[PDB]
């Protein structure tokens, strides 16, 4: 019944904003009453927070899998691809979750916590490439990592939402990989 | 009295969100009654739209000034600096204007129109560098320009807002210039 509420919310977010989805719709979709809804979640906003938490954690576990186990361009492409495929498979939760950063402190804090982790891991790998002599000591690794991660956040999510302007979804992986590799390996 | 309403709104946006500013506050600050306010603007949202329009147009005119008139790194740094200084001098209008993109179609359309223009100008200069043989033919110019402009949007505004995470404001110009120059000139 928890999973039924989450699946219903993800289904309805594909068709309309969270503001245009009510607890009755989630309750109905999940085959339960409204007071029964309130047993699993305090609000429709808590439903989105759980969906976002699951997508973020799936991306994070996929990146951990790569980290524990090719040329440098392919290494970066495989890592960026974790976020392209994971968020790209959950576009409605991505879109609604990003919009909720403005109005929900728990969604802002969830997004902020994982961004810090992904930036720290990006910088650790750039520093390892510098240590082994494959990357030059240009910018501070952590500052370069921050700007590249913020680029990917804005550019992936604009592509997925079909924003004007955006890189077409079929060109965004190649675009971001070029900018990562040239900025990490370039003097 | 129009300029008094705009100056009052920019002053109060430095201390609190647009939601926590009422027409009475703008009216009072500007030395006029509330019905007199409604003669100049239909809403506090129209006040923000005008402030944003002025900041965007000041950036756009500053970039036109450069365009009509040094090494390649300095050329890019001077252009990025137009946005760093212009938006950096109007942080409260930047922050509130970006937040209003979610709730106001005219603010979203204003932002979208100028982003398209700045991306088209970025691509035209990359193509000119390619034509003269200074930049290699890597990514499609317009796709590279889009991702670099979206990076700058996200990274500048995160820095100005002191977001977690963000590049410190005193490091963000150098950070963005490195990524622009390596990605435009790098193979
Ligand atoms: C030996 C293993 O090394 C690797 O796999 C290569 C690596 N890739 C990453 C990495 C981190 C963040 C992004 S990201 O910038 O796309 N996500 C945040 C933004 C988003 F969440 F919104 F996408 C993309 C790639 C770190 S290390
Ligand atoms: C011969 C003259 O050539 C030049 O001056 C070098 C040039 N710079 C630009 C340029 C365009 C957009 C940004 S930007 O990406 O920072 N703004 C959008 C995002 C923002 F609005 F949010 F900042 C930064 C630089 C285009 S051509």
Swiss-Prot record, chains A, B:
Residues 1-59 form the HTH tetR-type domain. Residues 22-41 bind DNA. InterPro entries: EthR_C, Homeodomain-like_sf, HTH-type_TetR-like_transc_reg, HTH_TetR, Tet_transcr_reg_TetR-rel_C_sf. It holds the Pfam family EthR_C. Gene3D superfamilies: Homeodomain-like, Tetracycline Repressor, domain 2. Keywords: DNA-binding, Repressor, Transcription, Transcription regulation. One of its GO terms (molecular function) is transcription cis-regulatory region binding. It comes from the Bacteria. Homodimer. Involved in the repression of the monooxygenase EthA which is responsible of the formation of the active metabolite of ethionamide (ETH). This is HTH-type transcriptional regulator EthR. It comes from Mycobacterium tuberculosis (strain CDC 1551 / Oshkosh).
């Amino acid at each position: 019944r928890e999973l039924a509420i989450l699946a219903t919310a993800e289904n309805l977010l594909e068709d309309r904003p969270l503001a245009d989805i009510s607890v009755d719709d989630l309750a109905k979709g999940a085959g339960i009453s409204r007071p029964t809804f309130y047993f699993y979640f305090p609000s429709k906003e808590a439903v989105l927070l759980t969906l976002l938490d699951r997508v973020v954690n799936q991306a994070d576990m996929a990146l951990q899998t790569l980290a524990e186990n090719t040329d440098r361009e392919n290494m970066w492409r495989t890592g960026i691809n974790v976020f392209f495929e994971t968020f790209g498979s959950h576009k409605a939760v991505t879109r609604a979750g990003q919009a909720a950063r403005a109005t929900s402190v728990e969604v802002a804090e969830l997004w902020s916590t994982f961004m810090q982790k992904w930036i720290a891991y990006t910088a650790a790998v750039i520093d390892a490439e510098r240590d082994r002599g494959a990357a030059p000591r240009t910018l501070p690794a952590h500052e370069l990592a921050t700007a590249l991660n913020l680029m990917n956040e804005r550019t992936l999510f604009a592509s997925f939402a079909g924003e004007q302007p955006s890189v077409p979804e079929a060109r965004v992986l190649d675009t971001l990989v070029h900018i990562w590799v040239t900025s990490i390996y370039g003097e």
